[PDB]
Amino acid sequence: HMMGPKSKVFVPLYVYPAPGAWDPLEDVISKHPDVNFTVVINPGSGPGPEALPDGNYTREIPKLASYENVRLLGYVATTYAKRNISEVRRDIETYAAWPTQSSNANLAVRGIFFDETPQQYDADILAYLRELTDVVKGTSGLGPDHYVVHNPGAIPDSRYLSTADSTVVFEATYATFQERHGAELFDTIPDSHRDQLCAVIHSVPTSVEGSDLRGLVKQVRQVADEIFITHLETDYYAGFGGQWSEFVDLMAS
Ligand SMILES: CC(=O)N[C@@H]1[C@@H](O)[C@@H](O)[C@@H](CO)O[C@H]1O
Ligand SMILES: [Cl-]
User: Fold this and answer.
1) Structural contact between residues 229 and 247, judged by C-beta atoms closer than 8 angstroms
2) Which of 87, 107, 127, 239 lies 20 to 30 Å (CA to CA) from residue 245?
3) 115 close to ligand 1 (CB < 6 Angstrom)
4) Distance between CA atoms of residues 9 and 6, nearest Å
């Protein structure tokens, strides 16, 4: 009659920061100081072409950063490790330089979310990702956490998991989750622990509500330490689902 292991709320926050747009996230952060939030921001598939993001980002990001239970990460694309590593490094360094380039201590992130990491094992690809982790851990401006997340959007070879602090090993519809027998899918992953794993479930039917939603949250908390669940089928990373506060309430329980 408990919810099992506690998980963090993972938020791919690709809502454009117009005035008020991030209010639903700030509200639940405020309501649940005991809950830990991992929040990815993404000005333009990366930090953007300049040293600093636009006026809306520069206003809103520090408001989120001001909460102790928020861990902000900068989105960086890797294009299945095919992207030139110097260009990836440029993006990491740009995020890292944000607080000093802005003279705003709170215009900063605490790590990097690497999108599109590949599933298939390859030694050269492992070396690429490990170097990227070294860059994140070693660069001023990404502290204190220097957090690293990989998003293969599917289960990668287990040898990749130790290179990141968290790996998104599920990112698909609720229907796909169900086709794969839910939490059972996570049991197939060798050399792994829930603490290394993130699950993203979108397109949840609005009928999965109340105790039905509690059940899903509990099932996923058992196997993944970071979780995003939303009932949106469209723009599920660019808006809040109709049961966003209920989802966070369950994560807090
Ligand atoms: C959970 C997550 O982050 N998914 C990414 C998202 O960041 C965005 O890049 C999207 C379209 O660009 O592609 C997905 O791979
Ligand atoms: Cl929708």
Assistant:
1) yes
2) 107
3) yes
4) 10
- What are the sequence ranges of the domains in the chain? 1-253
The set of long-range contacts for 213-218, using a CB threshold of 8 Å and a minimum separation of 24, is 213/243, 213/246, 213/247, 213/250, 214/3, 214/250, 214/253, 217/3, 217/247, 217/250, 217/251, 218/3, 218/4, 218/250
What is the C-alpha to C-alpha distance for residues 81 and 246, in angstroms, rounded to an integer? 37
Q: Output the six-digit token pair for 32.
A: 């649940």
Query: What's the one-letter identity of residue 105?
Result: A
- For residue 39, give every residue at least 6 positions away whose Cβ sits within 8 Å of its Cβ, in sequence order, or none: 11, 13, 25, 64, 70, 71, 72, 73
Tokens of 179: 């086709």
What is the rounded distance in angstroms from the CA atom of residue 53 to the CA atom of residue 198? 27
Distance (angstroms) between ligand 2 centre and the Cα of 158 equals 33
Q: Tell me how far apart the alpha carbons of residues 154 and 156 are, in angstroms, rounded to a whole number.
A: 6
The experimental method is X-ray
Q: Any known ligand binding at 145?
A: no
